[PDB]
Amino acid sequence: PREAAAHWVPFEDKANMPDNVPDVVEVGATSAPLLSASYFIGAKCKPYNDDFMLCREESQGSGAIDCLKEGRRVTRCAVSVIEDINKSCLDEFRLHWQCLEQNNHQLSGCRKAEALLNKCVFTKLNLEKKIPGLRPDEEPVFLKKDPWIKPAVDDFKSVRAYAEAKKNGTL
Amino acid sequence: PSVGQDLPPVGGYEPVQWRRNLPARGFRPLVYLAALCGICGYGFYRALGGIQERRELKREK
Ligand SMILES: CCCCCCCCCCCC(=O)OC[C@H](COP(=O)(O)OCC[N+](C)(C)C)OC(=O)CCCCCCCCCCC
Numbered sequence: 001p002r003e004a005a006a007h008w009v010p011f012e013d014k015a016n017m018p019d020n021v022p023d024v025v026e027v028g029a030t031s032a033p034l035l036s037a038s039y040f041i042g043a044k045c046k047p048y049n050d051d052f053m054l055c056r057e058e059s060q061g062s063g064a065i066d067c068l069k070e071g072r073r074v075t076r077c078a079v080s081v082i083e084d085i086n087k088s089c090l091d092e093f094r095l096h097w098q099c100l101e102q103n104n105h106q107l108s109g110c111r112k113a114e115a116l117l118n119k120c121v122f123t124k125l126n127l128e129k130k131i132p133g134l135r136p137d138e139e140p141v142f143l144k145k146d147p148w149i150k151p152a153v154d155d156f157k158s159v160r161a162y163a164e165a166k167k168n169g170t171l
Numbered sequence: 172p173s174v175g176q177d178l179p180p181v182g183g184y185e186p187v188q189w190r191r192n193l194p195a196r197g198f199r200p201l202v203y204l205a206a207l208c209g210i211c212g213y214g215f216y217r218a219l220g221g222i223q224e225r226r227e228l229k230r231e232k
């Protein structure tokens with residue numbers, strides 16, 4: 001919760017899970033693919049994530065050990081979403097997070113690639129990108145036309161793919 | 172007799188300018204104040220619009 005100062009030295013641990021708890025395979029996506037598919041991880045895995053944090057609230061202070069069985073399932077369902085999005089939308093998911101690794105991982109600067117990614121994932125994986133807590137009479141930010149905050153330079157691959165999706169009639 | 176001196180012209184020189192030539196230039200001051208308030212208000216329009224967008228972007232992230 002506080003960060004290490006004044007000569008911290010890092011250390012790691014040559015050990016294993018005990019036999020009591022089964023194997024769980026991990027998430028291997030880094031920040032730009034994780035930030036790219038964050039809304040679709042949240043759209044599919046909402047009741048699993050909320051049961052995990054509700055576990056953590058319910059049995060206070062035990063925490064780690066009494067919530068492992070649902071921390072299993074949140075990781076497995078997010079892995080399901082990520083390979084689902086790989087095998088359907090690999091090239092434009094890659095287009096999106098390759099836009100996102102420039103521009104400080106700001107979602108504000110990658111609108112023309114995220115329109116393509118949202119259209120693919122919505123027609124093929126049937127998951128929708130939504131911002132909750134947003135009452136009506138309020139436009140969502142990634143839908144608006146001519147925003148005030150444009151990026152410095154639009155990425156070339158995504159504006160080329162965006163124009164070709166215009167002329168195909170994809171989007 | 173007088174031969175070979177510097178003398179003035181037959182009709183004299185034409186008059187030079189010895190008055191103060193300080194013409195009042197510029198617009199009225201209320202024109203400058205109205206332009207100042209218009210520029211500043213348009214800048215506040217764009218600035219407060221951009222702050223509200225940046226807040227909606229923060230909601231997204
Ligand atoms: C880089 C950003 C900063 C820009 C500077 C600040 C904005 C300008 C505000 C003051 C000027 C103004 O607009 O004043 C406008 C007034 C108009 O007066 P008039 O109607 O002709 O008076 C009539 C009075 N008689 C009857 C006696 C004639 O004066 C002028 O035209 C004088 C010339 C101003 C030149 C501008 C200076 C810069 C030179 C480079 C050209 C761009």
Ligand SMILES: CCCCCCCCCCCC(=O)OC[C@H](COP(=O)(O)OCC[N+](C)(C)C)OC(=O)CCCCCCCCCCC
Pocket residue numbers: 137138139211212213215216217219220223
């Ligand atoms: C104490 C001085 C009071 C001055 C009052 C002036 C009345 C002007 C009302 C115009 C309303 C408007 O047009 O505002 C619109 C703008 C932009 O809004 P938007 O993002 O497009 O709206 C989005 C709404 N959604 C989210 C529902 C979609 O918003 C502003 O903030 C700018 C106000 C205009 C300039 C105000 C200048 C104040 C400068 C004060 C320095 C002393």
